[PDB]
Amino acid sequence: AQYEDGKQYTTLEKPVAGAPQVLEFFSFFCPHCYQFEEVLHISDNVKKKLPEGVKMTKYHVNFMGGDLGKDLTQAWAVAMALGVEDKVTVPLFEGVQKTQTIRSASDIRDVFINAGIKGEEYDAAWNSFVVKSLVAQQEKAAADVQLRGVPAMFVNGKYQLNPQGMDTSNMDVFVQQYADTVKYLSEK
Numbered sequence: 001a002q003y004e005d006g007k008q009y010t011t012l013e014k015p016v017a018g019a020p021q022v023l024e025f026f027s028f029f030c031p032h033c034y035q036f037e038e039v040l041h042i043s044d045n046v047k048k049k050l051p052e053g054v055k056m057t058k059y060h061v062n063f064m065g066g067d068l069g070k071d072l073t074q075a076w077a078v079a080m081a082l083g084v085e086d087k088v089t090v091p092l093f094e095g096v097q098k099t100q101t102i103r104s105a106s107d108i109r110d111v112f113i114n115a116g117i118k119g120e121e122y123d124a125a126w127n128s129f130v131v132k133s134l135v136a137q138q139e140k141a142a143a144d145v146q147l148r149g150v151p152a153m154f155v156n157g158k159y160q161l162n163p164q165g166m167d168t169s170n171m172d173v174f175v176q177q178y179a180d181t182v183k184y185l186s187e188k
């Protein structure tokens with residue numbers, strides 16, 4: 001077939017009941033994740049091709065970066081709670097991997113302040129139980145698929161994208177194959 005299990009996607013042996021329709025995982029420490037987001041814009045090109053009524057969920061993970069990796073999962077919870085993902089994703093990636101100026105929780109907070117989130121608003125979110133719940137949700141979704149590597153994307157708890165199996169040497173063609181595969185899975 002044109003789309004083949006083991007080719008552009010694999011099939012989870014233990015499918016996850018009640019999972020998000022389209023679930024992406026990343027770390028701000030993850031070099032391929034920087035490429036996926038900052039250079040290929042995978043999330044955006046996937047989102048822009050999802051069928052009507054299909055939503056995209058994107059969560060951070062703890063298993064890279066030790067202490068600071070957990071702080072970033074908490075900050076991503078703050079970004080989701082405040083709805084400022086589109087303001088902070090670029091400076092967080094660049095702060096961790098390009099300028100390497102993010103070395104502490106305070107340096108993460110500086111990115112939000114520079115992006116125009118008020119200090120009071122950030123600190124309130126950071127310490128909130130709504131954010132603790134969002135951290136818990138991020139951790140559970142990753143645990144449910146026994147996640148040990150990023151970037152990763154899952155569709156309906158059943159299928160895992162396999163970009164290494166998208167047989168093209170062109171990066172924009174790669175991006176659109178990836179997006180077209182998510183659309184195909186979402187329709188399955």
Ligand SMILES: COC(=O)[C@H]1CC[C@@H](CNCc2cccc(-c3ccsc3)c2)CC1
Nearest residue numbers: 032035039150151163164168169170171174
């Ligand atoms: C987690 O899996 C991965 O990260 C790998 C990454 C590269 C690989 C190459 N096949 C597609 C392709 C062709 C040409 C260029 C680029 C490209 C440009 C900036 S980053 C990657 C990708 C497939 C997936």
